[PDB]
């Protein structure tokens, strides 16, 4: 996260970290949607151009973490994965269209003050909240600047405005689709901020003005550089892929 700030403790209890077991490597972010299911970006698990194709046994997730420079005994929890499910039409060859994956935990995680699931949007939520100019929040342990420390110890948070689709489309030569949305400040708007490499899979959340609940509207997916004027970060449109999520969980 570039130009963000340290998160307050417990501010994002659905935050999940995805790790490679060996060697130890923090790969991406993710989010908790129930006591047994975690949502993330497909490219964090499968990306042939970078020789990436993880199986359940290669990974683990850490839930309930705040700081990397402290072992949060009996608060943070490590969980093993039972099964990974990548969207069948995830387009890794071109533009990361449908960059989404679900991971089922071997055992349910116990909720606590630091571990709690985020809501997934329904039709009414997507129609009311996913609008240009409205701001959402992105969180992660990814790069603090466009590069390659440079990685934070404490979870970073940044609020960013959703951008009009035509502006998103004209900002890049990569083909955008209805399964994505973009966010970020425009040049000279007075503020900066962006997700960055390492933040993929992390949630873009919005708070409902009607019921006080947080809804995960997007998943950090891609960008070109980080925080550059005139460029915007792209996110998987979670509601657009809701039917697939439900299908996978209903059938497991």
């Amino acid at each position: 996260i570039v130009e963000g700030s340290d998160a307050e403790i417990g501010m994002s209890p659905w935050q999940v970290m995805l790790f490679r077991k060996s060697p130890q490597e923090l790969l991406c972010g993710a989010s908790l949607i129930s006591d047994r299911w975690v949502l993330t970006a497909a490219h964090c698990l499968l990306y042939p151009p970078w020789d990436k194709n993880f199986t359940e046994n290669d990974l683990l997730v850490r839930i309930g973490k705040h700081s990397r420079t402290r072992y949060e005994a009996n608060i943070e929890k490590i969980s093993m994965l039972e099964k990974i499910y990548i969207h069948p039409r995830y387009n890794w060859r071109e533009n990361l269209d449908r960059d989404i994956a679900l991971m089922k935990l071997k055992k349910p995680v116990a909720f606590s003050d630091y571990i709690h699931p985020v809501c997934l949007p329904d039709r009414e939520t997507a129609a009311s909240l996913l609008q240009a100019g409205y701001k959402g929040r992105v969180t992660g342990w990814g790069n603090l600047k466009e590069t390659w420390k440079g990685q934070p110890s404490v979870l970073q948070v940044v609020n960013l405005p959703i951008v009009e689709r035509p502006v998103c489309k004209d900002s890049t030569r990569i083909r955008i689709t209805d399964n994505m949305f973009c966010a970020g400040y425009k040049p000279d708007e007075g503020k900066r901020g962006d997700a960055c490499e390492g933040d993929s899979g992390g949630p873009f959340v919005m708070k409902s003005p009607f019921n006080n609940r947080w809804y995960q509207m997007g998943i950090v997916s891609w960008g070109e550089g980080c925080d550059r004027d005139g460029k915007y970060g792209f996110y998987t449109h979670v509601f657009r892929l809701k039917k697939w999520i439900q299908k996978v969980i209903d059938q497991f």
């Binding site: 417990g10 709690h116 809501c119 409205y134 609940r213 809804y215």
Partner: peptide
């Protein structure tokens, strides 16, 4: 929706986090 999206240390305690009001205000601006 059960208890989804209501944070134990914030919504559940009627406590606001430091920047969520920026999000609520963005629904106007």
């Amino acid at each position: 929706e059960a208890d989804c999206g209501l944070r134990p240390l914030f919504e559940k305690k009627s406590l606001e986090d430091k920047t969520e009001r920026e999000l609520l205000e963005s629904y106007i601006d």
